[PDB]
Design a protein around this nucleic acid. Structure first.
Ligand SMILES: *[C@H]1O[C@H](CO)[C@@H](O[C@@H]2O[C@H](CO)[C@@H](O[C@H]3O[C@H](CO[C@H]4O[C@H](CO)[C@@H](O)[C@H](O)[C@@H]4O)[C@@H](O)[C@H](O[C@H]4O[C@H](CO)[C@@H](O)[C@H](O)[C@@H]4O)[C@@H]3O)[C@H](O)[C@H]2NC(C)=O)[C@H](O)[C@H]1NC(C)=O
Ligand SMILES: *[C@H]1O[C@H](CO)[C@@H](O[C@H]2O[C@H](CO)[C@@H](O[C@H]3O[C@H](CO[C@H]4O[C@H](CO)[C@@H](O)[C@H](O)[C@@H]4O)[C@@H](O)[C@H](O[C@H]4O[C@H](CO)[C@@H](O)[C@H](O)[C@@H]4O)[C@@H]3O)[C@H](O)[C@H]2NC(C)=O)[C@H](O)[C@H]1NC(C)=O
Ligand SMILES: *[C@@H]1O[C@H](CO)[C@@H](O[C@@H]2O[C@H](CO)[C@@H](O[C@@H]3O[C@H](CO)[C@@H](O)[C@H](O)[C@@H]3O)[C@H](O)[C@H]2NC(C)=O)[C@H](O)[C@H]1NC(C)=O
Ligand SMILES: *[C@@H]1O[C@H](CO)[C@@H](O[C@@H]2O[C@H](CO)[C@@H](O[C@H]3O[C@H](CO)[C@@H](O)[C@H](O)[C@@H]3O)[C@H](O)[C@H]2NC(C)=O)[C@H](O)[C@H]1NC(C)=O
Ligand SMILES: *[C@H]1O[C@H](CO)[C@@H](O[C@H]2O[C@H](CO)[C@@H](O[C@@H]3O[C@H](CO)[C@@H](O)[C@H](O)[C@@H]3O)[C@H](O)[C@H]2NC(C)=O)[C@H](O)[C@H]1NC(C)=O
Ligand SMILES: *[C@H]1O[C@H](CO)[C@@H](O[C@H]2O[C@H](CO)[C@@H](O[C@@H]3O[C@H](CO)[C@@H](O)[C@H](O)[C@@H]3O)[C@H](O)[C@H]2NC(C)=O)[C@H](O)[C@H]1NC(C)=O
Ligand SMILES: *[C@@H]1O[C@H](CO[C@@H]2O[C@@H](C)[C@@H](O)[C@@H](O)[C@@H]2O)[C@@H](O[C@@H]2O[C@H](CO)[C@@H](O)[C@H](O)[C@H]2NC(C)=O)[C@H](O)[C@H]1NC(C)=O
Ligand SMILES: *[C@@H]1O[C@H](CO[C@H]2O[C@@H](C)[C@@H](O)[C@@H](O)[C@@H]2O)[C@@H](O[C@@H]2O[C@H](CO)[C@@H](O)[C@H](O)[C@H]2NC(C)=O)[C@H](O)[C@H]1NC(C)=O
Ligand SMILES: *[C@@H]1O[C@H](CO)[C@@H](O[C@H]2O[C@H](CO)[C@@H](O)[C@H](O)[C@H]2NC(C)=O)[C@H](O)[C@H]1NC(C)=O
Ligand SMILES: *[C@@H]1O[C@H](CO)[C@@H](O[C@H]2O[C@H](CO)[C@@H](O)[C@H](O)[C@H]2NC(C)=O)[C@H](O)[C@H]1NC(C)=O
Ligand SMILES: *[C@@H]1O[C@H](CO)[C@@H](O[C@H]2O[C@H](CO)[C@@H](O)[C@H](O)[C@H]2NC(C)=O)[C@H](O)[C@H]1NC(C)=O
Ligand SMILES: *[C@@H]1O[C@H](CO)[C@@H](O[C@H]2O[C@H](CO)[C@@H](O)[C@H](O)[C@H]2NC(C)=O)[C@H](O)[C@H]1NC(C)=O
Ligand SMILES: *[C@H]1O[C@H](CO)[C@@H](O[C@@H]2O[C@H](CO)[C@@H](O)[C@H](O)[C@H]2NC(C)=O)[C@H](O)[C@H]1NC(C)=O
Ligand SMILES: *[C@H]1O[C@H](CO)[C@@H](O[C@@H]2O[C@H](CO)[C@@H](O)[C@H](O)[C@H]2NC(C)=O)[C@H](O)[C@H]1NC(C)=O
Ligand code: NAG
Ligand code: NAG
Ligand code: NAG
Ligand code: NAG
Lengths: 661, 668
RNA sequence: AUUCUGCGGAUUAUUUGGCAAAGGAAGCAUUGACACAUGCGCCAAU
RNA sequence: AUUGGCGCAUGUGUCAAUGCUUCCUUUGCCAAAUAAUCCGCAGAAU
């Protein structure tokens, strides 16, 4: 086994009998994932210390009351996915300290007597998928403190004020009841539960009426959370959840319900509902009176909540949710915004509209007008096919901090105005578009920027002076990867005293490092930590173009053509933590070059290079390898030598430098 | 100094100040052209009394004394083009009676008095163009006995008279140029006065349909055969236009670049002898059946860019209708490239029963699909050549060529063909030589694609994105007489050895750019190239090749040229080349070759002509370049750039070191 | 038979990653064709 | 000098060809996950 400290962990051993050869000084034992005859109730003397046991996923026929008295110190008994066809009270009579009881696949079709007239400390109690046709587990009031009764994937037909009353002052925190083909909730079938907090009627085929009816039985109860996922509420009315009026409801779920109708004031009865999920549903539209009722709601989810003859929500439909702060509407077909869509949400601080529109080709200055009085900080607009953003398009989103226009068709030339009004904007994720010609003023209007992504946006004109990023001083993270940036003059990046992370992966910045003076890129970004120049056409790192970058933590120059390392390219990276020069054309590893960075390094990576197995080359290196503990992955396979003949395909590591010096 | 060398003393652009005359007197020619020349010292030519001709043009020569001709009695060619010589009289050439070629092109000699050449009796070529001549007259007496070329073009002649032309009595001109001359009138009998006038060139002379129509009669009863009318304003023609030629014997006629919009009926009814006719670069609206009535002798017709642009919006797409070529029963070469003709008609080419060469490259605009009724017209025409490149052809249905029985060379390249050849598209090409089919959209092949035409010698399939060439048998299975095969730039995914089975004549094979990389342990390497004993030049440049497996070049004795450039090949298992002992040129440039051993490159290096392995990561140690560096020192197999592009890549002290300068005196 | 358990093997679909290659495009460099200039020296006719 | 013909050399632009670098897309193969279906060995439950 893994014999993990204290807790015995036997993963998958294809084990035969119940073993007792390892330590006897422990409190847990994993036997799960093994072939088990039955549980020897007496073979548990050598282990009189175990507190819990991972004993599920085994072929266990039956169990004797013996196993509980042999291990008085036992809180968790895991017996899920086992046989145990039938059982009575005897089995757990000696388990009074038990707190978590697990039985998931034991097809225990019926239950007689009061089987747990003992467990007083048992909270979790999963009895699901076991063929139970009833909920009853006794006629007396037991299970003093139980907080989870899992009965789902079972075949219960109904609930009565009688087969449920066995819980008297019993207060369940989470009562599961999924997959049960319930057709009726006998009156007062909840008034009999001590105090019922959570509930889960997932996949139980509920009719708008069974639902409408069930509600009243959920009245005057301490119920706060309720799940109705995967049912047939093809529609709802004010009368549907009418029964809940007498309740105190926090979260309500109605996802995956092919809900086509969401009648008026259907929720007029939840003046306390704070959370509501309408995910994956087919709603036709939302008139203004749609949400009348939820005046406490703070999180609304319409992820894929509409039909696909296009569906749409009209103005002043959210006017009632004056306390909502998180509105999600991803994966949908809504045409476009209206002049008054989001009118009313004066608390909205997080809004997502990823792949939510179909005809919003152009972002106009009248698009987000609705969100004028909403304290909006987040706005995801990815995947909307947005191809052009006119002036003042965001002027109303005064307090916006994180805006995201990625994975879109934007093809225009930022002239600083598109950001007119983003007073305090944090980051602007703008990666993955068609074309983004920049100008000298593109960002002058928003100098509050910290992160600016521009991945695969085919940038053009970044060589103009001053640097279009000139006004972005508080800028820390900047990404210009996968743009095939033709070229760029040093002016760029001038004054970014905070630029920490910079990405240039894939940008043919090749020739910029002789002819016309080597572009002393990266001047003074003292604070620059992780630099990325992977696959950039780099063939020659010129003398000291990494000077004064003391705080530079991670350099990545993979996928390049770099064999000519002028001694001293790395000098100030004496704080470097991880270097990457994989898939290059590196022949030799000298000390004047890789020395200083190798100093306090954490993990190096130079696999797949044409290593030369001679002493003018790998000598200093092979040794460092033998005598350093800087994590170097695959040193064993992918560090082979390429020359000369006798040393071809020879693991670089196994090179005796005992004949060299 | 000059170049001299063998009696033709050539002094190139030498910046020559004064006419130099050194010892190479034992010669017969001297080039002084392209140098700064004061004047020609008529006496400095004693040290050179042997010269037969002199390249003396493109120099600043003021004037010339009659002296230079008597100093060099042995003189046939006098080149004085692009020089000054403003004026001159008979004196200048009095001593040049042996002279046969006289050149004067840029000397602005505006007028000519007397009989300047009362001496030249052996002078044939006589170029006097761009010289400011306002007249053709060069004398009043009948001289220049035997002259075959009188070049007077780019001049300012206003007309030709039976008077200023008569100075040629029994004089028979073979080629009489008269281009750029602003001629407005041809005084009657202005040719009846030339002994015998064969050729003529009135290029860019601004001729009216009438000046033309008129000029014709003066060209009558003359010995005229060729006539050029390029760059004029014959915006149209009628039967009456060339009516004056009826009294002639006309071989070739040119009317290119004439914005000809009208080609009236029977405009050529008068040329029962014209064999050649060029209507290139013109704007003809259409060709009714009666268009070509008259040319029953024509054998070569050119309509290259000969019909008006397509309007599309103005619906003015020009076109020729049926039975318009019925008269040219003797034509054998018809060209109609660069045009807007809509498409073929059921009877377009009807009548051409001699047509053996036909070109229709970029001739059609709406011929998206080749139907079985397209080339019906060419049914009775002995067609051997057919270029259809650049027509946007995207689909060729069954029996599309059935009528072209005798076709040998067919070309459907640079087209949009996107269909799957199922052997039927070639139904009827009884004796077809080559099928150039490169540069199309997609050509899915089947097991029968070529079974119908086993007469194939060459089959090109460059950049046609072939698909399914791995099917068995090889779709080329029935092509036995096939010699040249090209499957380049198709990114052929893969292929099994079956392919090429039985091509005992396959000599040239091209595989440039086809990621055939991994084919050389997936179920064993593919014994591609089995038994093509007769394969001469093999090309596998840039093919992903990273490992040439053991002996996949066995029995290829007759293989002359292997090209494996742009690949990743450093692992050469001794003996990959054994039977290429006849190899003449190897190419393994831009690879990842470390070392050159003898067990590997030995046999081919034997009788080799030219090797090429530049740009590789050469290792400057003896386990590697040792045997090689020597071969270099002691072999004379032409190896280009051995000096620069054969540097070493390892180790450190030998990096960037010319491979050649490696002393193997410390090894072996 | 219906199913639970452990281990191993197979096929398909979707997603990703790597390698090789193709097409098109971008930046830089080289070469050749041509056109519009310039400076130097020499000349020619006014 | 006005206009022109030469000789040498230096410019810009357009077009075309070639080479290096790169990017986007696609194709072949391979690897890893996830899911669906299946098959073999071993023990078992009603
Ligand atoms: C507005 O909404 C958008 C969606 O509605 C938000 O975008 C979503 O962001 C999440 C989180 O970034 C994305 O999820 C993962 O995206 C990448 C891509 O996955 C790739 O790696 C997988 C690994 O197995 C592959 O299987 C995939 O095929 C694919 O190639 C992942 O790489 C991320 O995982 C990361 O996991 C750890 C966590 O830090 C890292 O260590 C890893 O290195 C790795 O990077 C993401 O979890 C999600 O794709 C995207 N939406 C979707 C589903 O498309 C958008 O961000 C939001 N705006 C904001 C900022 O609020
Ligand atoms: C039916 O008619 C077609 C035209 O209507 C004709 O099409 C072409 O035929 C061939 C190609 O198929 C072509 O050949 C000449 O042109 C190529 C291309 O050269 C290019 O590159 C040059 C680079 O410096 C550039 O200057 C040029 O401007 C041009 O863009 C040229 O390479 C050929 O010469 C080479 O030939 C050898 C190559 O095998 C080589 O070894 C030699 O050294 C030499 O360089 C040719 O000069 C024609 O020009 C195309 N026609 C036109 C006008 O487009 C079809 O071939 C014809 N079908 C048949 C076969 O009947
Ligand atoms: C074009 O036609 C011919 C070219 O073949 C040229 O004229 C021909 O000139 C010859 C002799 O000069 C003529 O010969 C005569 O032929 C007759 C007919 O058989 C014969 O009986 C006589 O004995 C004599 O030999 C010939 O007829 C004549 N051809 C024509 C036009 O009929 C001339 O170059 C051109 N035509 C003309 C005259 O413009
Ligand atoms: C959901 O409904 C209510 C949310 O608005 C809230 O009801 C609370 O009910 C208790 C009843 O025990 C009230 O407490 C009263 O307790 C005794 C009654 O015997 C009085 O002497 C006290 O003075 C006190 O008023 C609460 O006032 C009432 N909550 C409030 C402040 O509105 C519960 O959250 C839920 N009701 C239940 C338990 O079903
Ligand atoms: C939102 O306002 C932008 C800034 O005013 C505006 O920029 C565009 O228009 C201005 C003129 O209004 C251009 O600036 C210059 O204006 C003078 C005359 O006022 C012109 O002589 C000069 O040629 C130039 O046009 C900006 O250059 C121009 N931006 C670009 C690069 O197109 C926006 O147009 C406007 N909203 C949009 C996107 O239309
Ligand atoms: C000319 O090109 C093709 C060559 O014959 C020709 O083939 C296609 O049609 C034939 C029948 O004419 C198909 O042959 C078979 O026909 C029997 C009919 O009973 C089917 O049962 C059998 O499955 C098969 O289809 C060919 O399969 C089919 N394509 C090939 C050659 O695989 C074309 O029809 C003809 N050109 C056209 C499209 O008119
Ligand atoms: C919600 O109920 C209304 C019925 O009341 C009307 O609409 C309210 C939003 C409010 O504005 C009241 O003053 C109105 O009296 C449904 O509204 C329309 O009802 C008519 C009935 O003739 C129907 O034809 C329309 O389709 C409805 N929509 C329009 C054009 O206003 C509304 O349909 C109900 N919500 C849904 C769609 O279930
Ligand atoms: C050449 O002459 C034709 C008429 O002469 C021939 O036209 C053939 C199409 C055919 O009928 C043949 O038997 C006949 O000998 C002229 O074309 C006609 O021109 C008149 C104007 O006078 C118009 O009515 C038509 O465009 C056209 N009609 C016909 C019957 O073709 C024309 O002068 C010239 N051809 C062309 C179009 O250039
Ligand atoms: C309703 O939702 C779940 C139980 O179904 C609970 O969620 C809240 O408590 C969790 C701690 O266990 C937090 O991690 C969750 O983030 C939090 N929900 C939120 C605000 O996201 C919650 O206890 C249940 N009912 C309530 C509100 O008590
Ligand atoms: C964005 O600004 C306003 C939106 O408030 C748009 O409308 C105004 O623009 C012009 C002002 O003279 C006129 O064309 C409109 O009549 C005027 N209307 C309003 C709302 O007052 C404006 O068009 C938008 N910007 C543009 C032009 O794209
Ligand atoms: C007319 O044709 C050209 C004029 O440019 C010349 O060449 C002709 O004769 C050559 C010798 O047989 C051939 O090679 C040419 O193909 C042929 N040109 C033609 C007509 O196509 C020649 O000057 C002329 N020939 C004569 C005298 O008729
Ligand atoms: C190609 O073959 C002939 C060539 O003219 C076309 O015509 C024949 O086939 C057609 C049958 O649908 C009809 O046009 C006639 O039956 C016949 N014509 C004859 C010989 O008079 C034929 O249409 C073309 N191929 C097809 C059938 O599409
Ligand atoms: C970015 O730079 C700093 C740090 O974010 C911001 O300065 C803050 O605000 C004022 C400066 O005028 C002072 O209170 C402190 O210097 C900073 N306070 C802190 C620590 O948050 C500066 O205002 C920012 N620039 C922008 C986006 O306007
Ligand atoms: C291709 O191979 C040869 C090429 O010469 C062809 O045979 C010649 O052509 C005919 C055959 O019909 C004979 O009359 C000749 O005598 C043969 N050449 C000589 C003189 O030996 C053969 O027919 C062709 N094969 C195919 C399928 O086209
Ligand atoms: C729960 O248990 C008893 C019944 O056994 C019940 O009467 C009483 O209300 C509760 N006692 C507690 C735990 O306070
Ligand atoms: C001819 O030769 C003489 C010999 O002295 C020389 O001076 C003269 O320059 C030559 N002719 C010229 C001017 O070229
Ligand atoms: C050419 O010479 C004279 C010119 O006067 C002429 O009479 C004679 O007949 C011609 N020679 C021939 C062709 O016999
Ligand atoms: C219990 O398991 C052990 C396995 O080590 C075995 O030796 C012993 O015989 C078993 N006892 C029973 C129940 O027979």
């Amino acid at each position: 086994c893994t014999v993990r400290y204290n807790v015995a962990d036997c993963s998958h051993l294809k084990l035969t009998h119940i073993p007792d050869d390892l330590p006897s000084n422990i409190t847990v034992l994993n036997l799960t994932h093994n072939q088990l005859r039955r549980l020897p109730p007496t073979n548990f003397t050598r282990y009189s210390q175990l507190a819990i046991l991972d004993a599920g996923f085994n072929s266990i026929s039956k169990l004797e009351p013996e196993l509980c008295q042999i291990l008085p110190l036992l809180k968790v008994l895991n017996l899920q996915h086992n046989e145990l066809s039938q059982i009575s009270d005897q089995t757990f009579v000696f388990c009074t300290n038990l707190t978590e009881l697990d039985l998931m696949s034991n097809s225990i079709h019926k239950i007689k007597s009061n089987p747990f007239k003992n467990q007083k400390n048992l909270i979790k109690l999963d009895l699901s998928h076991n063929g139970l046709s009833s909920t009853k587990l006794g006629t007396g009031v037991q299970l003093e403190n139980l907080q989870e009764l899992l009965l789902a994937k079972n075949k219960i037909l109904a609930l009565r004020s009688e087969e449920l009353e066995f819980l008297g002052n019993s207060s369940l925190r989470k009562l599961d009841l999924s997959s049960n083909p319930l057709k009726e909730f006998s009156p007062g079938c909840f008034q009999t539960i001590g105090k019922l907090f959570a509930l889960l009627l997932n996949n139980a085929q509920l009719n708008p009426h069974l639902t409408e009816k069930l509600c009243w039985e959920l009245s005057n109860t301490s119920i706060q959370n309720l799940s109705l996922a995967n049912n047939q509420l093809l529609a709802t009315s004010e009368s549907t959840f009418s029964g809940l009026k007498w309740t105190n409801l926090t979260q309500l779920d109605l996802s995956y319900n092919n809900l086509h109708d969401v009648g008026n004031g259907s929720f007029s009865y939840l003046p306390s509902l704070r959370y509501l999920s309408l995910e994956y549903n087919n709603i036709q539209r939302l008139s203004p009176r749609s949400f009348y009722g939820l005046s406490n709601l703070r999180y609304l989810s319409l992820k894929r909540a509409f039909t696909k003859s296009h569906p749409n929500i009209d103005d002043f439909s959210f006017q009632w949710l004056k306390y909502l702060e998180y509105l999600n509407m991803d994966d949908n077909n809504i045409p476009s915004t209206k002049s008054n869509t989001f009118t009313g949400l004066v608390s909205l601080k997080y809004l997502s509209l990823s792949k939510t529109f179909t005809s919003l080709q152009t972002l106009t200055n009248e698009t987000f007008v609705s969100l004028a009085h909403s304290p909006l900080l987040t706005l995801n607009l990815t995947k909307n096919h947005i191809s052009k953003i006119a002036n003042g398009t965001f002027s109303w989103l005064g307090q916006l901090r994180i805006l995201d226009l990625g994975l879109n068709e934007i093809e225009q030339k930022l002239s600083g105005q598109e950001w007119r009004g983003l007073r305090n904007i944090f980051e602007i994720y703008l990666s993955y578009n068609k074309y983004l010609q920049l100008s000298t003023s593109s960002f002058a209007l928003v100098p509050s920027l910290q992160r600016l992504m521009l991945r695969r946006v085919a940038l053009k004109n970044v060589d103009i002076s001053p640097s279009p990023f000139r006004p972005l001083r508080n800028l820390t993270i900047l990404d210009l990867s996968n743009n095939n940036i033709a070229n760029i003059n040093e002016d760029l990046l001038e004054g970014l005293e905070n630029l920490e992370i910079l990405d240039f992966q894939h940008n043919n910045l090749a020739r910029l490092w002789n002819p016309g003076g080597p572009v002393n890129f990266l001047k003074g970004l003292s604070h620059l930590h992780i630099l990325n120049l992977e696959s950039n056409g780099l063939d020659e790192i010129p003398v000291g173009v990494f000077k004064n970058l003391f705080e530079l933590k991670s350099i990545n120059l993979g996928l390049n053509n770099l064999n000519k390392l002028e001694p001293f390219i790395f000098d100030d990276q004496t704080s470097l933590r991880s270097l990457n020069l994989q898939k290059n054309l590196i022949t030799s590893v000298e000390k004047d070059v890789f020395g200083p960075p190798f100093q306090n390094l954490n993990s190096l990576d130079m696999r797949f290079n044409p290593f030369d197995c001679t002493c003018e080359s790998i000598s200093w290196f092979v040794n460092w390898i033998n005598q350093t503990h800087t994590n170097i992955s695959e040193l064993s396979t992918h560090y082979l030598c390429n020359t000369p003949h006798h040393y071809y395909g020879f693991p670089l590591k196994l090179f005796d430098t005992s004949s060299c010096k």
